Amino acid sequence: GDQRFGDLVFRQLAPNVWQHTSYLDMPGFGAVASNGLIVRDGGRVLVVDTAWTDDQTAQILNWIKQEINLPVALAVVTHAHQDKMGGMDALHAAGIATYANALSNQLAPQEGMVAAQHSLTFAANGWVEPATAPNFGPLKVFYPGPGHTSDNITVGIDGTDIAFGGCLIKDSKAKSLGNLGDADTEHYAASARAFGAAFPKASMIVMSHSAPDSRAAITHTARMADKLRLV
Ligand SMILES: [Zn+2]
Ligand SMILES: [Zn+2]
């Protein structure tokens, strides 16, 4: 089901959801994949996560114009690292409203990222404060606690079986938790568990650095994180 468009790959996940994949192209690194989502919400399109670069993000927008041909109403980015927020300038040049956790926007200058235009804030139970996420349609945004980074957020797609863990969740056969440089090793397992409990009916778990998996991705990630905490 994958389809290559320029240097990107797109895979349809549901009648109105696609995963976008872009690859890092930097002179001393391998071709590291990062996945985000495209959601068609009736007469508009919603994007979760940029690509690694502005030019890759413009190619996502070009695929949307060709294959869907509806305006992109907003994008949500899941934490302040290059794979999720590296293409913010391309979204703003296209007139697309951008949203991120306040804490992602605070961290963005230190991380080399351009901040989103709007800041999301969260209740004590992890759910997004609705007034900060107006007109998000089927996107249900949840902050599960610190894990892969202090700011990482997750997104369920109402009307589908899909929930997106971003860089917090790894697939059920992952050998490690990946990029831990910014990670909260004490709370990571409970944050992975909180993601699972926030979207308890989701059967397709989408994540940044693995292909879509079953809910076993969630329990495997929480186990890896508990091992690491115990070491
Ligand atoms: Zn990251
Ligand atoms: Zn990542």
Curated annotation (Swiss-Prot):
Regions crossing the membrane: none
Keyword Signal recorded: yes
Domain of life: Bacteria
GO BP annotations, alphabetical order: antibiotic catabolic process; response to antibiotic
Residues where substrate binds: 170, 179
The organism of origin for this protein: Klebsiella pneumoniae
Molecular function terms, GO-annotated: beta-lactamase activity; zinc ion binding
Subunit architecture: Monomer.
Enzyme class: hydrolase
EC nos: 3.5.2.6
Role this protein plays: Confers resistance to the different beta-lactams antibiotics (penicillin, cephalosporin and carbapenem) via the hydrolysis of the beta-lactam ring. Does not confer resistance to the polymixin colistin or the fluoroquinolone ciprofloxacin.
Binding site for Zn(2+) 2: 83, 167, 209
Catalyzed chemical reaction(s): a beta-lactam + H2O = a substituted beta-amino acid
Protein name: Metallo-beta-lactamase type 2
Keywords: Antibiotic resistance, Hydrolase, Metal-binding, Periplasm, Plasmid, Signal, Zinc
Binding, Zn(2+) 1: 79, 81, 148
Record keyword Heme present: no
Subcellular location: Periplasm
Portion held of the full protein: 42 to 270 of 270
